[model samples]
Target: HKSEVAHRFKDLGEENFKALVLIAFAQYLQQCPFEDHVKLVNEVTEFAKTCVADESAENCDKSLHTLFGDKLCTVATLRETYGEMADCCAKQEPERNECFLQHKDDNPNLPRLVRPEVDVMCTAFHDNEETFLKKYLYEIARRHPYFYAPELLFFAKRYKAAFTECCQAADKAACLLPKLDELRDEGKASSAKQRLKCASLQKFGERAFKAWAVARLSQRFPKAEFAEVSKLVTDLTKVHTECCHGDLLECADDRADLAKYICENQDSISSKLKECCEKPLLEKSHCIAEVENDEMPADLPSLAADFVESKDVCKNYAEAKDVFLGMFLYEYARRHPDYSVVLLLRLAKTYETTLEKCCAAADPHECYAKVFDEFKPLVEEPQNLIKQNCELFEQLGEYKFQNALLVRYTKKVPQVSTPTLVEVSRNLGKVGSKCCKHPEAKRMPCAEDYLSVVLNQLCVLHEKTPVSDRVTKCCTESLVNRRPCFSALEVDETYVPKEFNAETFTFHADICTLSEKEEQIKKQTALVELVKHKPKATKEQLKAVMDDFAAFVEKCCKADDKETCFAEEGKKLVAASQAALG
Candidate 1:
C-alpha cells in the first residue's frame, strides 16, 4: 500500500517525494507488492536526483519526464486532482495509508525504460577504470535506488570509497580560498566566472551527497527510485541548511545548538530511514510529526526543572497557557464548531489571566493593556456573531414547538422541528426548503421581522452585558410563547379577565395609532375590538365567532379578519331589529 501511494505520482517535488517514499516503505513492509514498492522507491529517487541536478526546476511535468520518460509523465496534468486527494488525506480521521497498502497491487502494470551504461567516459587517466566505474555506479544507486538494484551493490561499495577520496581532495580546495579571493580582485577573475564555478561546486556536492544517501536507502529498498533517493537527499540538505546557514542559524551559538540537536536526532534520522525503506509508506509516515504542539516536545527539557531556578514560575505558566489556549481554540474551532462558543469563552478567560500575569510582573500596564486589548476585539467578535444569530434562534423557536405539535397530531408527516438557535443559524441555508410557499403566507413578515428585531436587540444587549447575563436572558425569552398575537375569537379568552380586556383595548388603540400609515385607523379599531371581546369570551364562543368573523371579513375586505371579526355583528344586527323586538 505504501509503495502504491509513493508510486501514485510519476514524479513529485522534493518534500512530497520524501513523504511518498516514507509511506511506500511503510506499506511495502506490510505485504504490498514488490512491483508497487519498486515503483515508489523509483519515484522518490527520481524526484530527489532531479532536484539535485537542477534546483530551479519546480514543474512536476518537466522534472518527471527528466527522471522517468515523457510517456510516464502525467504528474503535471493530474496535479490539481492530486491536490484534492492529498487534502482529503490530511483531513481523514483514521487516515488512508492502510487502505492504500491493502489495495496497492490492484492496478495495471507499468513499463520501464532502457538506457546506456557508460563509466569514466572522459577519463584523464585510463588506469583508474575500476575505481571510477565503482564510484559512478554507487552514485547512481545511492541517489536513484529505484533505478539501481541489489546486484549493483558490489561495484557501488567500491565506488563509495573512491568517492570518499575524491571528497577529501575536493575539501583540500578550501585551503586555496585566500588565493581565490585575491584572484577575484584581479582583472583576471570575473564575478560571473566565479558564480559559475561556485554553482558547479554546489551542484557537485549536492549530487555526491544525494548519491550516497540514495545508495544507502536503495540497499534497504532494492526497487527504490532515483527520485526517492534525491528527495531524501534534499531533506538532509534542508536539515543541513537549518543547522548551517547564517539565515537559519542567526548566531554561532544557534549553529552550535543545531549541531547538538542534530547529534541527538541523528539516531532518530537513521531509524526513520531504516524503517521507511523496510516498511509500508503508511507506517513510515507516522515517523514524521507534521502536527505542531505548543507544549514542549516530548524530547524537550522538563518545564518543572527549567522553572526550578526561574524567579517567575507564574509568568512562565501564564505565557505557556496563553500559547496553549490559542493553539487549543484554533484546533477546537477547526474540529468542533458546535462548541466554538464554549471554547472562545475559555480563550477569553485565558487571555484575562495572561493580562493579570503581565500586570503582576510590573510590566508596562499600558503596553500590556494594548496587547490584552487586542484579545478584547476577538472576544467581542464572537458575541456579535452570536447575537446576529438570535434571529435564527427566534425562527427555530417559532417552528420547533409548533412543528413538534404538528408531528404529534399527524404521525404520517415526519418530525419537522428545527434544531436549537445555534443549529438553525448554522443550517440557515438548509432551512430555506421549509419556508411557506403561499403568497399570503410568504407575505407575512411577522416571524422574519420579529427575529430581526430580536437579533438587533440581542447585539445591543450583549454589547453591554456579560455572556452569562446574555445567556440567561436568552433562555428566559426563548422559553416564552413566540406567537405574535392571539385573539379570543380563534383561541380561548377565558384565561383573561374583563378588566384586563378593557385595559388591553385602550392600550391596543394607543399603540396602533403610533404608526402613521393611513390603514392604522382600521388596525386600531380591530385591535380594540379584539381586546374587548377576546378576553371576556369563552373558548367555544370565541372559536365560533372568530371563524365566522374571519369569513365575514373575507367577504367584506377580500383579504379580511387579520385583526377583527364581523360575524357576531352580522347575526345580532339581523335579529335585534325593531320589527322583531316589538
Candidate 2:
C-alpha cells in the first residue's frame, strides 16, 4: 500500500497531500517490528524515489521528502553499521554493535509493520550474506588456510573444520585439495598464479563441499542417501574436468584408504564431534607402527552417519569443484570460439540442476536466486564468439529431425509384436508422406531408412509397455496451426453490440436528465455554501482543497501529470479569480 499511496499522490494537486500522508504513514510504520518497519520504509522510499525520478511518470519533486526521508534514515543506519568500524577498539565489535543497535531500535515497535513476509525478506538477505561469506572467506580459506591474518586463525580454523566436518557429515565424494589448484590453473599453472590465487585442488575441494552440503541437507528431510551420488559427481567432473591429473581413479589409493575409514569405523562419527583430537588416538608405538604400515583402524560411524558424513565431505568437494568449474567455464567462454555455445548450454543446465536440487535440500531463500544469479550469464547472454557462429548448428538439423521422428514413432509403436520387413516398408512409405517436406528430409538416406530407424527406435523405447494395456494408445497426429474465423470469436466492446439500454435510448432519454450536469451544480452549490460558512481558505481550507483535488485526480488520472497540470492552472486561476473578486 505504500506503493498505492505514492501512486495516488503522484500528481501536482495530490503531491502535498501525499507528502503529508507519507510522513505520517512512515512514522506510523516505524512503530512496527524493526524488520517489517524497515521493509515498509524501504519499499515506500524506493517507490517515492522512483516516482520523483526523471523517467518516472509522476515526476514531481514535491514529494522528495517522502522519497528520501526513510532512505536517509536507512543510509545513516547502514553507514553506522560499518562506518564506526574504523573507530572500534576491538575486532568485529562495530559490526556486532550495529546489529545490537538496530535490534534495540526495533524492540519497542512491533505492531504497525507488514507481517510475516518482511521477516522472509530479511532472512533472505542474511542468507545471501552467509553464502557469500561461506564462499570467499570460508571455503577459500578452508583449502588455503594460511592466507588470512594470524589473528583470524581460530575463526579460519573453525571454517576449515566446518568444511571438513560438512564433508564427512554429508557422504560426498572425497575431493583432493591438490587436484583443485592444479585444474584451476590448468595450462597457465605458473604465470596465472596471482590472478587466480587458489589452486585447482582448492577449487575441487570447494566442489566437494557444495556436493556434501546438498547431500547432507537432503538427508535431513528425506533421511535417504542419493542412490547415485558418486555417478552424479563423476558426470559433473567430466564436464568440468581440466586435466587428467584430477581424475578420481588417479586418487584411488587415498580414496581406498578413505573408504576403509568409512567402512571400518561405521559407529563412531557423531554430531557432537569437536575435532580430530576428540577421536581415539593410537598409543605411541602403535601410532608409529600404524603409520609405517598405513593401517590405522577406521572408527567410522553407522550407515546413517556415513550417509550424513559423506554428504558433508561431498559438499566441500563440490564447492572446490564449483570454483574450478566456474573459473574454467569463464575462461573457456572467454577464449574458446567454437566451444562457447556447447559449454554455455552445459553450464546453464548445470546451474539449473544445481538450483533445483540444492534448493530442494536447503532453504529456497538460501539457494534459489543465488544459483540463478550465478547461471544467469549463461541464460541471458551468448558470448560474442558464440553469437558470431550461429550457422554452425545447421549441420545438427538432420540429427535433430531424425531424433524427432524417432520420438514420434515411439509414441505410436506397440510394445510386443515386432513388425515384419514388409510392414516396415509400408511404414517407411508413410513416414516419407508425413515428413518428406520437412527441411531435414534431404539429409535422410531414403524414406525406407527413415522408416526403419524410427520404427526400431520406437520399439526400443516402448518395449516396457504392456501390449494389451487399455491405457496404451498410438500417437495422434494433427495439423500444427490452423487459423480461426470470426464466427468463433466472442463479442467485445469494439465489436457490434447485441442491444442498447432502453434508458439510454436517444428517443426516450431527456437532455436535462444528465447526471454530470446535476453533479456540477451540486459541487458549485457546495463551494458557495462552504465559502458562506467558512470564509476564505484557511490552513484547514487549503488542506481541504488539496485533499479534494488529490481525490479527484487519484480517481481520474496519474499523480505527476495532475500536479503539473494543477500548478499551471492554479497560477492562472488565482490571478483571474483575484481580478474577478476585485
Best by lDDT: 1
Model 1 segments more than 4 A misplaced? 1-317, 337-453, 458-549, 555-582
| TM-score of model 2 vs. true structure | 0.14
Best by TM-score: 1
Q: Estimate the TM-score for candidate 1.
A: 0.20
> How well does candidate 1 score on lDDT at residue 76?
40
TM-score of each: 0.20, 0.14
Q: Write the per-residue lDDT of candidate 2 for residues 62-128, one digit (tens) a residue.
A: 3433333333344334344435422322324324333322322212323332223323433443557
- What candidate 2 gets wrong by more than 4 Å, as runs, is 1-199, 202-226, 231-377, 389-582
Report the error of model 1 at residue 159, Å: 76
Q: What is the per-residue lDDT of model 1 for residues 1-582, given as tens digits with 9 covering 90 to 100?
A: 213223334333444444334332422232333344455556657755654555554543342212222222223422252333333233222233322223323222333322222222223114565434433333333232122122133233433344344434544234333333343222111222222223323544543333333333332322323344344445654543332221211222332333344234434333334433343332223223211111212243332233223344445546765343333333223222222232234443555565556646654343344443455555454344444434453564633333222222122111111122222222232222233222322212222322333333333344454343323344233111111111001323223322323222221123333533333334323323443333343435434543554455445444334233234444443233212222
